[PDB]
């Protein structure tokens, strides 16, 4: 963690870099009921969705965690 005392711009930029919404959306997936709310209830087309599900699959279910 890099800290600069007395500035909110550094905290905002650090929180933007650590939790970039495009990359964090790319490495995960939208829930199905949420997708149904976007496409049918809100009129958003399929191709206007952010790109999701780019995380590589693990070998097993046992290899997916360190616990």
């Amino acid at each position: 963690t890099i800290e600069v005392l007395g500035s909110s711009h550094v905290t905002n930029s650090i929180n933007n870099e650590l939790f970039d919404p495009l990359i964090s959306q790319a490495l995960s997936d939208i829930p199905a009921i949420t997708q149904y709310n976007m496409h049918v209830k809100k009129g958003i087309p399929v191709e206007d969705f952010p790109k999701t599900g780019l995380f590589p699959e693990p070998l097993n279910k046992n290899f997916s965690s360190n616990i």
């Binding site: 890099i2 800290e3 600069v4 005392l5 500035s7």
Partner: protein
């Protein structure tokens, strides 16, 4: 902080000098070597004055004669907040950085920028937190009763402070420090309430404190180069930082110095075993020593009239004559019986070893016979041999048993030259069989 078991130079706390830079016979763990200690004190005054730059000092002498001890004493008497970069000669032959780039990084790690700044903090003891929440989480309301040992107050809290207090959960009885500008909340612990443990703070809640930062030039060089972040300061893949950003940092540092926003501190770059460097390193040092942003370089070596690496001729101290023209030389000398006895007594007091007098005389005799480091190494083995037979004081036969068990250089050479048929020579011929 700064965990450490016992080092070889851990008994040295600084150069033992008076106000006239005269060396005491025994002070701060350093005995003997009066002229070398006085010269190193003059070098320390050069560093503390800071008005001159790029001066090279060579420390040369026999092995095991107070060279690294002198460097450790100079580093201890420098104190904290002044850069000191102690590297070895074999540490710059890298695989991802060139030799000149590694030498440039080691040069720029020893010049610091001093910046003073002020920040305001709220360090206090939480009496009561009241949180009002809605069903959907739209609007949050918050009351915070917080106090010191001197005051007491109640604060209305906005939504982002509610989010910052819910995250990193603060309960009643805690001692916390809040930064208003950045929103960083740190739990110092719990107060003295039996019903870890710290003391409730005193004075005003809203304090304003001045902190002093010392940032090396290499850190600003890494930060200003946009291709890599600050993590290369920890991971180490800086990777051939260009000279343009070095020029920008060199201009901006002088711009800050003229405006009075920052200050220049110079440091010491120590190169231990300097004879292992290549000729291209010496040719780089010959031009890098003449910069304004150049520290004081102390080099230690023990070679005498050896081959310069990268060439085929022989030079004094393993260094070429153009480098030796740019240096002043401090020369060390061998030790007497009394100084060896005093050094061994200091090392006996350091490792919590109780010694008899006759054992100390035997150690001094075998120290002036073989080596200083051999008697400095026997003194802790003899304590374990003493503790095996359940007594505290190390006696004469305890030293004799360790002398019998553990050999030195000359006896090993004698036994090898006596029974060389059982070892592998240069030609790779050995005899493993006993008969015939």
């Amino acid at each position: 902080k700064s965990l450490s078991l016992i080092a070889a130079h851990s008994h040295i706390t600084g150069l033992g000098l008076d106000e006239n830079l005269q060396p005491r016979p025994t002070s701060e763990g350093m005995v003997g070597q009066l002229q070398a200690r006085r010269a190193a004190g003059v070098i320390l005054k050069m560093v503390q004055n800071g008005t001159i730059a790029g001066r090279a000092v060579l420390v040369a002498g026999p092995p095991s004669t107070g060279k690294t001890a002198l460097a450790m004493g100079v580093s201890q008497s420098l104190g904290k907040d002044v850069p000191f970069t102690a590297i070895a000669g074999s540490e710059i032959f890298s695989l991802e950085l060139s030799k000149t780039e590694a030498l440039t990084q080691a040069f720029r790690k020893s010049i610091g920028i001093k910046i003073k700044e002020e920040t305001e903090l709220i360090e206090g003891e939480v009496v009561e937190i009241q949180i009002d929440r809605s069903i959907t989480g739209g609007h949050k309301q918050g009351k915070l009763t917080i106090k010191t040992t001197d005051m007491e107050t109640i604060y209305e809290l906005g939504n982002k402070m509610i989010d910052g207090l819910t995250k990193e959960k603060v309960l009643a009885g805690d001692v916390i420090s809040i930064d208003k500008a950045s929103g960083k909340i740190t739990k110092l612990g719990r107060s003295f309430a039996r019903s870890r443990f710290v003391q409730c703070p005193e004075g005003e809640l809203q304090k304003r404190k001045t902190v002093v930062h010392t940032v090396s030039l290499h850190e600003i060089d890494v930060i200003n180069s946009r291709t890599q972040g600050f993590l290369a300061l920890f991971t180490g893949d800086t990777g051939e930082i260009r000279s343009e950003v070095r020029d920008q940092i060199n201009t901006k540092v002088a711009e800050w110095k003229e405006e009075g926003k920052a200050e220049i501190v110079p440091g010491v770059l120590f190169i231990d075993e300097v004879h292992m460097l290549d000729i291209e390193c010496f040719s780089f040092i010959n031009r890098a020593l003449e910069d304004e942003f150049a520290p004081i370089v102390m080099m230690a070596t023990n070679r005498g009239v050896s081959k310069t690496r990268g060439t085929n001729y022989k030079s004094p101290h393993g260094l070429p004559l153009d480098l030796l023209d740019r240096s002043i030389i401090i020369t060390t000398k061998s030790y007497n019986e009394q100084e060896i006895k005093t050094i061994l007594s200091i090392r006996a007091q350091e490792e919590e070893v109780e010694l008899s007098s006759d054992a100390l005389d035997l150690l001094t005799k075998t120290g002036v016979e073989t080596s200083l480091r051999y008697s400095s190494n026997l003194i802790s083995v003899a304590q374990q041999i003493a503790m095996k037979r359940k007594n505290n004081t190390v006696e004469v036969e305890d030293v004799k048993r360790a002398y019998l068990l553990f050999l030195d250089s000359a006896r090993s050479v004698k036994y090898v030259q006596e029974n060389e048929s059982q070892y592998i020579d240069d030609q790779g011929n050995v005899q493993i069989s006993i008969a015939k």
